[PDB]
Design a protein around this ligand. Structure first.
Ligand SMILES: CC(C)(COP(=O)(O)OP(=O)(O)OC[C@H]1O[C@@H](n2cnc3c(N)ncnc32)[C@H](O)[C@H]1OP(=O)(O)O)[C@@H](O)C(=O)NCCC(=O)NCCSC(=O)CC(=O)O
Ligand SMILES: CC(C)(COP(=O)(O)OP(=O)(O)OC[C@H]1O[C@@H](n2cnc3c(N)ncnc32)[C@H](O)[C@H]1OP(=O)(O)O)[C@@H](O)C(=O)NCCC(=O)NCCSC(=O)CC(=O)O
Lengths: 135, 131
């Protein structure tokens, strides 16, 4: 009877958001000790950044009992950028298939493309995710 | 700078890794009590194991950076948990080394990944990024 989730999420198609995001010291690539003084941003950290903008975008539009979690992601990190920098981060909803929302993401530093991504959030009732996490 | 890295093919490494507080998913204030591990954090964990594997076999003036990554995050897992992280070199083309990675929590798959490192001289990077 808590089996009352049947939406068409296509209302999300075409939504977009761009934000300026600070690349801070928690985001540094630190695998290689000899490269530390460059403090390049880590690929995973940039992926984190792009994902988080997609949540900010969705949260305005998700019905009240539903959250959205990343289930799939693809990224190409094409230019190294140092931390301590602000970047422009854009995401747009390029498709919806059931409860799967697909985004394209871009990280620009000035006019240089740093990273591009394509990724998927599953839109799930908080109750259901909580039950799954706890089982 | 002309080397064959084909010899990396089939190399593996597995590591028991703690998921700590710095890796928590916190976008959703109503789910903070579950302290789920973030996707990007888990990708970081998988990438880092591939660097430990490569660093053992690369010449002393060379580094390796991630240029592409793909991941399915199939099961939620809380921080404060230890996971088995395995990576394997499945392919080499020039200075491009493709890995498959897996995160397991016991017998449950949490995440699978496929990603590429480019093997580069540190000086090259240092030249590029200081230009
Ligand atoms: C790695 C790149 C520089 C690669 O750029 P390109 O593809 O244009 O260049 P390339 O890879 O073909 O070649 C660049 C260099 O490779 C070396 N090179 C190429 N082929 C070679 C071979 N067969 N043998 C030996 N050396 C070789 C050359 O010295 C040098 O080229 P030449 O001789 O021509 O100069 C760039 O994609 C980049 O900077 N990406 C950002 C990566 C990043 O910052 N990642 C985050 C860190 S890792 C991380 O953060 C982990 C985490 O997620 O947490
Ligand atoms: C998201 C998942 C639960 C998805 O699992 P499944 O594919 O089995 O489930 P599912 O999506 O098909 O369906 C689950 C639920 O969705 C709801 N549901 C499905 N379709 C629907 C529709 N059309 N309308 C309304 N509701 C719908 C159903 O109520 C319910 O299940 P039913 O009817 O079946 O009972 C799982 O893959 C998972 O936990 N993955 C890990 C995700 C994660 O932890 N990400 C990290 C946080 S985000 C993040 O960390 C950002 C960062 O990277 O930094």
């Amino acid at each position: 009877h808590h089996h009352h989730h049947m939406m068409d999420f296509d209302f999300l198609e075409g939504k977009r958001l761009t934000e300026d995001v600070a690349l801070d010291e928690t985001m540094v690539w630190n695998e290689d000790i000899e490269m530390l003084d460059l403090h390049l941003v880590a690929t995973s950290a940039l992926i984190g950044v792009v994902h988080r903008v997609s949540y900010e975008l969705l949260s305005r539009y998700l019905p009240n009992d539903y959250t959205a979690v990343v289930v799939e992601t693809l990224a190409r990190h094409v230019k190294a950028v140092p931390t301590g920098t602000r970047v422009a981060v854009g995401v747009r909803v390029v498709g919806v298939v059931g409860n799967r929302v697909k985004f394209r993401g871009i990280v620009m530093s000035g006019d240089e493309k740093i990273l591009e991504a394509e990724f998927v959030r599953a839109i799930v009732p908080r109750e259901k995710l909580r039950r799954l996490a706890l089982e």
